[PDB]
Design a binder for these strands. Structure first.
Lengths: 125, 103, 282, 59, 40, 75, 46, 59
RNA sequence: UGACGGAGCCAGCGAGUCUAACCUUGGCCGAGAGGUCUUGGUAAAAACUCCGUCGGGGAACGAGGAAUUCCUAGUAAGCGCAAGUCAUCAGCUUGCGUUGAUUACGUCCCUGCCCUUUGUACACAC
């Protein structure tokens, strides 16, 4: 068996599926390395998990994502969401709970939107 | 919140709300801007029972791994929490730790 | 909760279907009650009966507003979201402003980027007892849909002979007091349904000496609608026309909420049927 | 509908009227057009085919 | 020829006045339609 | 979510404020990527000419330009 | 204006036609059938 | 034959689902391998086709 | 507040054997009706992103006065595809997406509008 964990990400109408496997230590957003998600004003808004948690936590494992739906800004937000959620899910399934809880704390320190997308419901008056 | 928030307590300061959720979690949300300031995972450290008539383990059980009542102390420092399980816990907020766990 | 909505609506449709299936028992018990009071022989069918004939004690103990609203006909205030169609031209926005003004208990929503399933949700979930959607044609208004969010009915009217108040004159302001209502010439069962919908659209129990009246008149299958202020004199009553004045015509009634587009249709304006124009209320 | 008429005058005269496609489905003639000069629009019964021939009775 | 649907009415002095007098008489009689409290 | 309560607008970072107010224009409504590219290049010019620090200069500008006593037309 | 006039007159004419039609058919039924049942009551007598 | 939109076919409840089995593109091993007889077997399979079609039309 | 050439990349609605133009030269065939071929002219995803280049219009007009009208969050304003639903809509109408702010979230002073001006409810409290 291969240690394996999947998560999701949803901005406006954009889907982002993210597999996370234990493996050779890389990151691929749909068949092309994450350094070439194209917007280029947002590539760091994609990196944000990578950087904020430091690399080795990723050096251990392989992350594959595919994204669809929405557009540019929505897809970038969706990938960042899926990466972060996938990281915490894998570290709470096959690795230690201390990493789990402190990762969740680091994220919710920075900006909670990496975890719970807001379903930004319409409002009465 | 990730789960359903089935117990609610509010700080004397009135700036913070402690919320206890069916995933075995207590959160502390600040209320001037609505955001999760500090969380305390509890699911692990609850001494929860196995009834005489059951047919599954008291580890794999899932009837009794959430906190159903919450209250802060009055320095806004500690939480007393209790459930429909065997034990009453007493967390310390600023470090997010368990100070003790009675039976 | 949508689990709860689905269950509650399903119960309702089932209860209605069985009321339909036992109205004949209503009529039969009516016959037996009649004969018992004024002792006359029973027909063969009832006479040979022994099951009903026997249990007709409880049912002997047994024993108007329309149904969907009777749950809260006069208890909470029905509140309304008047909502423009989409990308609304300024004249249409003016019209929606004035209609929100017209009703009491009404509030106004600009429609941009709100889809109907999402609007219908956020309504059902906030509690907004009615929805109004307005459609235009080069600033002119032509369509008005009235939807009732507790899984209720939606009457889609057309509306034609509009007159806009800001267009009329610098007439000042309305009275916006809980109004009085006048309804004329609604006769058929459909007429009663329409008056039921509009009435429960309005508020309840106006203060016994209010000053403005809104009136819905039937004239040749076209509803007219006016607003008026009336100040009583000792010799007569003279009034001032106010509010929009426009001519309105029902053209379908979906028993679902408006977004359904495949709900159950009670009536629809047949207008290629060969005898279309000889009859009223078609 | 494209050749029952040749002038918007004419179609305005005849509009709001009652027609039946040879197929036997009813419908009404409703509004003249502009950029073509005699073509009008009808609201029919069902999706009227291109392979039909619409008619209008007259005495 | 024939036709499919009665065209819309157009308002005039006669229509306005007839509706207006029906309204005024209904006021003189105070015959009114309205949602009443269901008390208790 | 910086415009729901009264002051979430305050809690929002400063550079985001500047970027959005910058894209507020007649034909620049709805091009935030244009706004952000714009401010990035501006700060580059800032660092090249005035050597010290863009963000510090931005903060200094905002504080020194904030008005401190206004008037209102009397009734 | 022509539309409203024409539809009005057509409705009046069709309704009046129906009324006359029922008037006639029913008067035949009443008168004739009455005297026929008279004659039949006669025939069964013999 | 009828055809279903994507939302419908992606949301049908389990039991009442549809079964659209897509054509196989990359020719597979067994379909490569299998022999199909010739000559008299050729003509015989032709004949059986013909006979079954006839009897079906008859019935 | 730009123009132009190549690049870069992402949507959601909709799927009835039904969805779609007319004039024109002349060939052949055809008893004809007509058919085939020629034949000439007129009707119908954007923005965004990275590289490159340039540096007033054929009498009117250079972002549109005075007054008045609408607007508080996926809202203002941009931007393209699609459908045409028994009323209404092609001079258009309605949906579906993507990009996404500024500033009050207060006050009854003005402008109107409402209300009440008797606790009646059952404590403790004014």
């Amino acid at each position: 068996a291969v240690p394996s964990v999947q998560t999701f990400g949803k901005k406006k109408s954009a889907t982002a599926v993210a597999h996370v496997k234990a493996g050779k230590g890389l990151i691929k957003v749909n068949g092309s390395p994450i350094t070439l998600v194209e917007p280029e004003i947002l590539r760091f808004k994609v990196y944000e998990p990578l950087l904020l948690v430091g690399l080795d936590k990723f050096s251990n494992i392989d992350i594959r994502v595919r994204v669809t739906g929405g557009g540019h800004v929505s897809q970038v937000y969706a990938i960042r969401q899926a990466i972060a959620k996938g990281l915490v899910a894998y570290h709470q399934k096959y690795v230690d709970e201390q990493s789990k809880n402190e990762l969740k704390k680091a994220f919710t320190s920075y900006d909670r939107t990496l975890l719970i997308a807001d379903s930004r419901r319409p409002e009465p008056k | 919140v990730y789960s359903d928030v089935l117990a609610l307590s509010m700080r004397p300061d009135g700036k913070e709300v402690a919320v206890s959720t069916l995933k075995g979690q207590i959160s502390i949300f600040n209320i001037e801007d609505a955001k999760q300031v500090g969380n305390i995972d509890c699911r692990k450290d609850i001494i929860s029972g196995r009834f005489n008539q059951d047919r599954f383990t008291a580890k794999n059980s899932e009837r009794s791994k959430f906190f159903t009542t919450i209250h802060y102390s009055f320095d806004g420092m500690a939480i007393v929490a209790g459930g429909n399980n065997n034990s009453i816990c007493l967390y310390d907020v600023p470090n997010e730790v368990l100070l003790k766990r009675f039976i | 909760m949508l689990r709860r909505q689905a269950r509650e609506r399903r119960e309702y449709l089932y209860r209605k279907a069985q009321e339909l299936q036992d109205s004949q028992l209503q009529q039969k018990r009516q016959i037996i009650k009649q004969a018992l009071a004024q002792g006359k022989p029973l027909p063969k069918e009832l006479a040979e009966d022994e099951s009903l004939q026997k249990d007709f004690r409880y049912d002997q103990s047994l024993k108007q507003v329309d149904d969907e609203y009777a749950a809260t006909s006069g208890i909470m205030d029905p509140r309304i979201i008047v909502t423009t169609s989409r990308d609304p031209s300024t004249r249409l926005s003016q019209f929606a402003k004035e209609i929100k003004l017209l009703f009491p208990n009404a509030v106004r929503l600009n429609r941009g980027n709100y889809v109907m399933p999402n609007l219908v949700d956020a309504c059902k979930k906030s509690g907004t007892t009615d929805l109004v959607v307005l459609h235009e044609h080069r600033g002119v208004p032509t369509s008005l849909t009235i939807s009732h969010f507790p899984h209720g009915p939606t009457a889609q009217f057309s509306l034609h002979n509009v007159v806009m108040r800001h267009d009329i004159i610098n007439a000042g302001n309305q009275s916006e007091v809980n109004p009085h209502l006048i309804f004329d010439n609604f006769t058929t069962a459909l007429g009663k349904r329409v008056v039921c919908i509009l009435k429960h659209l309005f508020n309840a129990g106006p203060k016994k000496d209010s000053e403005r009246v809104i009136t819905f008149a039937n004239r040749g299958d076209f509803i007219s609608v006016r607003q008026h202020v009336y100040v009583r004199t000792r010799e007569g009553v003279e009034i001032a026309e106010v509010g929009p004045r426009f001519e309105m015509r029902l053209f379908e009634l979906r028993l679902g909420t408006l977004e359904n587009k495949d709900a159950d249709v009670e009536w629809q304006l047949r207008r290629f049927i060969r005898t279309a124009n000889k009859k009223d209320y078609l | 509908i494209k050749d029952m008429f040749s002038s918007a005058m004419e179609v305005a005269r005849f509009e709001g009227a009652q027609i039946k496609t040879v197929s036997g489905i009813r419908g009404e003639i409703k509004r003249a057009l502009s950029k073509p000069e005699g073509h009008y629009r009808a609201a029919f019964e069902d999706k009227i085919l291109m392979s039909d021939i619409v008619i209008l009775r007259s005495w | 020829f024939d036709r499919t649907a009665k065209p819309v009415p157009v308002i005039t002095s006669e229509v306005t006045e007839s509706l207006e007098d029906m309204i005024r008489r209904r006021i003189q009689d105070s015959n009114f339609d309205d949602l009443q409290r269901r008390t208790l | 979510r910086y415009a729901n309560k009264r002051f979430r607008k305050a809690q929002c970072p400063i550079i985001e404020r500047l970027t959005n107010s910058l894209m507020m224009n007649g034909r620049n409504n709805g091009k935030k990527l244009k706004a952000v590219r714009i401010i990035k290049h501006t700060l580059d010019i800032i660092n090249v000419l005035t050597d010290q620090n863009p963000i510090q200069v931005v903060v200094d500008a905002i504080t020194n330009t904030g008005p401190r006593e206004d008037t209102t037309r009397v009734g | 204006f022509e539309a409203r006039q024409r539809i009005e007159e057509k409705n009046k004419e069709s309704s009046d036609y129906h009324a006359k039609m029922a008037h006639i058919v029913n008067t035949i039924n009443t008168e004739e059938g009455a005297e026929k049942n008279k004659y039949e009551r006669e025939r069964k007598l013999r | 034959g009828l055809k279903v939109p994507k939302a419908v076919q992606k949301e049908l409840p389990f039991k009442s689902q549809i079964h659209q089995m897509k054509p196989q593109k990359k020719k597979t091993y067994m379909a490569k391998r299998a022999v199909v007889l010739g000559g008299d077997e050729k003509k015989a399979r032709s004949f059986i086709q013909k006979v079954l079609t006839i009897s079906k039309a008859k019935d």
